[PDB]
Amino acid sequence: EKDFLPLYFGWFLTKKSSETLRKAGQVFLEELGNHKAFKKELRHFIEKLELVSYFGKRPPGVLHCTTKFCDYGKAAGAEEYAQQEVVKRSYGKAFKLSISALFVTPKTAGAQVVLTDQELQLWPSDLDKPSASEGLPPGSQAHVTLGCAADVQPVQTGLDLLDILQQVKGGSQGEAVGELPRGKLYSLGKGRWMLSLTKKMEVKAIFTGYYG
Ligand SMILES: Nc1ncnc2c1ncn2[C@@H]1O[C@H](CO)[C@@H](O)[C@H]1OP(=O)(O)O
Ligand SMILES: [Cl-]
């Protein structure tokens, strides 16, 4: 009989790295909601809005950077991803993930992950809406979800990041609207915001499979 697959594969941050990022994420949301530029534009996003409340679904376990959602084999391309030599070799192995930005949209809040070439070997080739189908390099939408609005799915986060990076690719980033302690704040319109970190945040994570 066939072995079924994980619910998903990905890099699971260590306890310390997950907590560090979770805290940084929450501080960004607090700082962003307090920011004059954010308060000004509040009409294109949805007394002040507490974004920690707004993103009212948060990952309950450790934070992670998903590679391939498999749904135990039920997802397209799951078996082909899982049988890869590099996935088997990397299973249980520790990696460093670099985070270059934090972002918010009306649907999601996340961290942008900039994968190394080694790590891109674990990035699936068969994603719906791959980076390449928008002229972005593969794995450009790698992320760690920090929170979701109530009616949103965690998947949305990668789509939101791709849309943000499409825009930044058009150079439509705009002058920074603010200088937060850990970087420059950009208003991308339509309720989309990016904090571009002065120093990339490195987190430690283990590549493996989650079954729930
Ligand atoms: N097509 C899909 N359907 C469900 N979850 C997906 C998915 N693609 C990626 N994921 C990720 O798999 C995990 C379980 O649902 C979530 O963390 C989720 O989003 P995330 O990577 O943005 O957090
Ligand atoms: Cl891709």
Author numbering: 161 to 206, 213 to 378
List sentences quoted exactly from the publication behind this structure.
In the vicinity of the bound nucleotide and the catalytic core, the side chain of Arg307 can swing towards and away from the active site and, therefore, could play a role in the catalytic cycle. The complex with adenosine 2′-monophosphate (2′-AMP) reveals that the R307Q mutant binds the product in a mixed conformation, whereby only the phosphate position changes, and the β5-α7 loop also presents a linked double open/closed conformation. Also, similarly to V321A, R307Q presents an elevated KM, while kcat remains at the wild-type enzyme level. In the substrate complex, Arg307 is positioned towards the active site, like in the wild-type CNPcat apo structure, whereas in R307Q, Gln307 is turned away – quite similarly to Arg307 in P296G complexed with 2′-AMP (see next paragraph), and notably, in the sulphate complex determined earlier, where wild-type CNPcat coordinates a sulphate ion at the nearby anion binding pocket. Gln307 similarly coordinates a chloride ion in the anion binding pocket, together with Trp289 and the backbone amide of Gly305. This loop opening might be modulated by the conformation of Arg307, since our R307Q structure demonstrates that in the absence of Arg307, the loop apparently has a much higher degree of freedom and adopts a mixed open/closed conformation.
CNPase consists of an N-terminal polynucleotide kinase-like domain10, a catalytic phosphodiesterase domain11, and a membrane-anchored C-terminal tail, which contains a cysteine residue that undergoes isoprenylation.
